[PDB]
Structure formats: C-alpha cells, structure tokens
Amino acid sequence: REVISIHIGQAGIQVGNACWELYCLEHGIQPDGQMPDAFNTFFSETGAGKHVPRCIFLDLEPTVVDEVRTGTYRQLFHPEQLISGKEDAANNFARGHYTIGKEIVDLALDRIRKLADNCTGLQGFLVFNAVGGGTGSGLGSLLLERLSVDYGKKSKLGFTVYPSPQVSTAVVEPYNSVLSTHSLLEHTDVAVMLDNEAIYDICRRSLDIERPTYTNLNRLIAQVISSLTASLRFDGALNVDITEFQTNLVPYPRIHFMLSSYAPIISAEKAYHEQLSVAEITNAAFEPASMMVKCDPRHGKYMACCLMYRGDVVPKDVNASVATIKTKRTIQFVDWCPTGFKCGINYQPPTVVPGGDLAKVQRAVCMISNSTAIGEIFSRLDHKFDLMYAKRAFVHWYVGEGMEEGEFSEAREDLAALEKDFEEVGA
Amino acid sequence: MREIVHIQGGQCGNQIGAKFWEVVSDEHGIDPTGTYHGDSDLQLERINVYFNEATGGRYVPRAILMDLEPGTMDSVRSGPYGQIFRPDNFVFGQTGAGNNWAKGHYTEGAELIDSVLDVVRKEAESCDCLQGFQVCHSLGGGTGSGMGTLLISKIREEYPDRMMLTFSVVPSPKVSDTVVEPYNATLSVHQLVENADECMVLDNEALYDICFRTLKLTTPTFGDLNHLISAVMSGITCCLRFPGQLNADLRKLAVNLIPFPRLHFFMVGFTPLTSRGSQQYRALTVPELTQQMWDAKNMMCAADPRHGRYLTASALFRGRMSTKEVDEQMLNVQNKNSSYFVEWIPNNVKSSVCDIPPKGLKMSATFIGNSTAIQEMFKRVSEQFTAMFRRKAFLHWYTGEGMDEMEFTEAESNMNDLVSEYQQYQ
C-alpha cells in the first residue's frame, strides 16, 4: 500500500516542505536520506540504505524550488521530483491554465506516471494547492483534469487553500478562486478546505504565538495530514483507509466539502496545565474556535463526520463521548442521517518536531466533517465576485491571454447552482 | 469523593492562599515541582479533595486566582510552590480597582466575572460530588471584596446546594489600612449575610498580639500571619482528608454551629502556640491544649469572648488522643464558666477527633466558636459608617459610578438589625 502526494504552487511546496520534514521525523529518517516497512507507504528504499519520497513539488517560478534544492533536504529530495518553470503565472488563471500549462503539464504527468509504475499498491493521490494564486489554480486545474482522464477511478484527496473573507493578500483572487471551483467540483473526489484566518485565530488563541508566520501554519497542517494517513502507516485497533472518506462522508457526487478540525492544540507549558482526556478533546474539536476554515457550524447542519484518534485510545470512552455529543442539542444534525459518525483509531501517538510549539500529547483527534456552512462560504465569495465582475474589472488580463467571458458567466452560474444544491440538501 | 474548590480574590487573599497551598502541599507530601514524594500511604487517599492529576502524576491544585493587577500575580509566581498552579486559571484583569467597591462590583466585574465564572464552572463539573466552595479574600479592599462578593452571589445563584467557606479579614480601627474601610466592609457584610453560608472572621490585630505574647517574635512579617491562617484552614479541612475516630464533615460542622440562618459569623483560634524558648518547658496533653484554646488572648478576632456569651463552639482535635479526656475536658470547661455560655442550648460544645496531627507536631486543635461577641466588631464598623455617611464624605466616587444612596441606607439597616438580633440572643 502506498499513497503519493503532489504539491502545486508557492503554497503547495511550502506545506510540502513542512510535511516531508514531519514524515522523515516520524519514521526516524535523517535529512541526508538514510536511517541511523512502515515507511514504505511514503519513501521507497533504493539500493542500500537510502530513501526517496513519492512526491512531486512543482511550481512555475524556480526561486522557491531551488530554495528547497539548497535547503536542508538536498540529498533527501530526488532531483527530478522537483519541477520548476522558468517564469511565474502571476495571479492569473488563464495564464496558468492555457499558455504555461501546455508546456509543463506533459512533463509533470510523465514524471508522475513512472512514480505510479514504481509503486505497487497505490491507494491514490492527495494534492496540495492554493486557489488564490496562479499556479495552483490554473495548472492545478489542468493537472487534476489530466489525472482524472488518465486514472480516474483512484481517489484524489484535495486539501485546498481558500481565501478568507476579510484577510486577503491579492485582488483577483475571486476570479482565480471561482475558475478553480468549476474544476474542483468534478475532478476532486474528496475536497477539504483550508482557510488562513481560522488558523491565524488558532495560533493566536491556543498556541498563543503573538506574531505567527506561514511556517507555523504549515507545521500544524502537516500534523493534520499525518493524523489522517496514520491509519495506512501504523498499526491501529480500528483502521480507516483512504476509501472511507469517499464512502462515509460523501453522500452525493457534488457535495464533497468538509470542515476540518484538530485537538489538542496546546503549547509547551499548557500541556503541564491541562488534564488531557478523551471526552474534552472530543468536545474541543467541535467548537468553531478550533476549525481550520472560518465559518459557523451553528448556522449550518452537520451531514457526516469522521474522527481519527491517535495514541492511547480505548473504544469505550470515545464511544461514550460521541454518545454525549449526539444527545447534545446545541449542535444539530440533518434528519437524513441518524448515524452521522465514523471513528477510526491508530495506536501511534503523534511525534514532536524540534522548534514547534505543540507539546508531546498522549492522544489527538482529527475531525473531518461535512456541513452546510460551506454553502454559506461560497455565497460570501460569490457576492464579492459579482461586485467586481459588474464593472468588467481586470478582465482584459484573461481575455488577452486567450479566454473569453464564457467561462466567467458559466463559472458564476456554477457557483449559483452549487448554492441551490446546498440550500436544497440542507432542508 | 467530597470536593472543595478554592478561589482567591484580592492581594490579601492571594498571599494567604499562596501560603495555604504551600502548607497543604507539604502535608500531602508533594514537592513544588508537582510530583508525589510522600512516604506514608495515608497521603494518597484523599488528594482528590484538593488536587487533580494531569499527566504522569503532576498534581496541580484546584484553585482559581482572581485579581486586577499583575503585581500580586508576580509575587505569587516568584515564591516557591508557585509553578504548581494552573497557568490558564490565572483569570486576571488589567486595570485595577483600587479600593473602590463600585469598581470591583459594577465596572470591572461586568467584563471579568464572565470569564472567572466559566473557569469555575470548568473546575466544578470536572469533579463529581462537590462539597463546597472556599474563597479567601478581604473586606476592606476593592478588588477582593467587591469582585469576590459578586462572584459569591453568582455562585449561589448557580449552585445553591453546596457549602461555602469564606476566609475574610475584617478591619480594625487600630490596624486600619485604607480610609474607606467601612464603606467597603458594610456593603460586603450586607451581601454576605444573604449569600454565604458561613464565614471565618479574621483580623491582623489579633495576629499581631499573638506574635507578641505567645510567639514572642521580633519580625512578624505578612508571611507569618499568612502562615497562621493557613495552619488554621488546614486544620479546618483535616477531617475530610484523614480518617478519625469521630469525623466531622463541613456540613456537619455548619449544622452544629449555625442555629439561625443569619447567625453565621465565627471567631477562630488555633493551638498550640509556644515560643522556641518555652517550647521545651511545656507539656502536650489535652488539658494543656484546652487551657490554651479557651484563652481569650488566643482568639484570632478583636472580640473579647469574656464580653459576651457563646452561642455554640466546636473543637477539632488532631492526633491520637483519649476521647474520654476530650469530652470530660469540654464538660469541665462548660461547667466552670457556666455564665459565659448560653442557657437555652445544652452542651454548647461540639467536638471531633482526627487521627493525623500536623506534620512534625504531636497533637493540635482548632477552635471555631460562634459567639455573640462579634456584634462589638460590627457595631465598631457601623459607627464609623454612620460618621462618614452623616456628612457624605468620599461619597461621590461611589455615586458617580452607578451606586445610589439607597444601597448605603439599606446596608446600614441590615447591619443594625443584625447587631440587634445578636443583642436579642445575648
């Protein structure tokens, strides 16, 4: 069994640069490529005492790529698995989708094909991209299309970086976000949103870092990814594989959008403080103060949730806690699904990265849930997209690059459709 | 099994509570780093009454610090046994009330008390069967009296079926720190007669006189007074933490000591207290403890018990003692001084015996006498209140903030009728 991960964009490979640090630390692999079979799902063992990940970083600017090439993990990351374009896509969907896409995507899928050929028990792909930028949106959409037409039946778990409502680093990110969704719907099988204001609130509130940067965000997102691959990696009492998020959480072919959460998010001294037990962190992973996406599940209705548990966990108390959360009323469920939970337990407790702010915890919970507050998110982004499009602003960049108003109107009405579906299902 | 949640308010309460957790941790044998290091297996049996194991035997106290200035917080964290507390339970404002009861009860309470109520809720349902609440504060201060009182009212609104102990120091004119002492004490008493179940009246004057005469100290700093009160409080809840021949739970003490719902003001004493020079020249027997207990110069209030009657009194003993010696001593002291006890209640002395003395000592005791001599103190304060209120001194820093003249008139009426009912039962 193996799963390969691809990273697209400036955000993609910075998350990857934190994620692959965590894997090397989790399986005890030195940054120079050798230890001093649980690793087989991520690193392939070449020759004698050497490991080379099942990953492809790709970007259109060479600056952050050769930063990785000259960082710590020079010997670790294989030279070919870092694709680097000669010039940026520059916050432009059509630029990243039609001109440069045609010249980079063929080499990418050529590489990924012999990654899949060297693999044997491939579970699927999982992707990391940002829809606000140009590379992650444009050729992220292109590569996901060509992955779907090549393999298709395999799962494609997508962790996507959406724009926050108020905190924004660009101007044309509505256009790039919208044109990304229109392919994010029918090419991603299971898509998990990852905003930024929510995690800024998290690192300010619980981890109490007053001045956080992206690397902190990357490190705990990497912690989430590890907590939901731990089942394939490590021996558990009740395992839950990649095929389960497909089944137990996606009741409809066009409703696959999940709220993610994590607990316990704790500092070094607050670990000495708090008595960490199962029930209170199962409670903590439900309040909006610990979600990775800025939205309110109070005004929404849950659809289905999945809970990975790592560490010293017996099925008794986790079953007792979900029983208390079902008899609670402040959060409510749709009447469609009375048994709206899935659990999954892995024995391995999460590791600690030197220099991170998360302490050594005995047990951790990763909750991936579906709701309708995401249907509120897309409308909140829809409104501010229409405001800009009403004046034909910034349009000439895309048209001059090769596109027209067609994909504008059609992606705008697509979000309108998805709005109708979410309000219809939420009833 | 039975549970006590500890709350600390104001500077006086915080420093008293700090010494209290030092004494308690020393008794249960945990070092200031938070691990268990006791030898006898009698210590583990009842640490759930006060502590919570977090992970790997790190025992933290079930306490909640509450104030408005970080100065008390830094003085608490600086000393030993300071890092044992809950870093999150330092619920804590930033402005500072400054001896203004309206600021502690109307201005800053309104935006800090939600948070402290949330954390005291967390610590309440974290345990199963509460026994009561235990708050240490003052009655002259602003952030101690006002905020603590509003906290008490909110708690009694939430959990009306649990006990409540408040260790509150009362101001004396001889030892008078601030100038608005009656303006704070009268209002807090007005709220404690309706909210708290029973309280332990303390004052610094009686402590100073004790360190003069019986201890013969030359430098009785605040740490020493706080050490005396902490030994008193440890003696109070000794019966829940250790088995004895005649156990006395907190409610058991309350129902024995409170014959009328409004007559719940206690004077407290502790024994033995002997200087290092004379500690070699004394005996350790129950008559030795008793002659020191019923001494008027050993009460920790500014109220001469020879100036009134006792309604009831309780004696909590610690150590392997003869029970026949205990009750015959209580019978003897009640028969000799038959005038100073009340007439319409027979056997005015409740007694109890625990089988564990304070660490290193052989036999100790704690005296809690609900006497009627406390009316002298309230009259002593209410007359100052009338004197200032006759001419409205200092009144506007209270009126201009939301308080009215009606509160002060109501406080006067309640204090006066309280002293009237004490004089009635005399």
Partner: peptide
C-alpha cells in the same frame, strides 16, 4: 473548556487514590 458546549467528564487518578472504582483497580484434573 468549550465555547458553546459543556463537557461532562470525571477525573482519573492513579492506583492509590480512593475513587469511583478503586476496589476494581486494586483487583488487578
């Protein structure tokens, strides 16, 4: 604790402390 939800738990102590199930913790041709 929790923002808009209130958890119900009981604390767990070591072997020595007399708690809800100390007797059963002590029990362990």
């Amino acid at each position: 604790s929790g923002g808009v939800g209130h958890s119900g738990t009981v604390n767990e102590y070591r072997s020595g402390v007399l708690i809800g199930n100390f007797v059963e913790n002590a029990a362990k041709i």
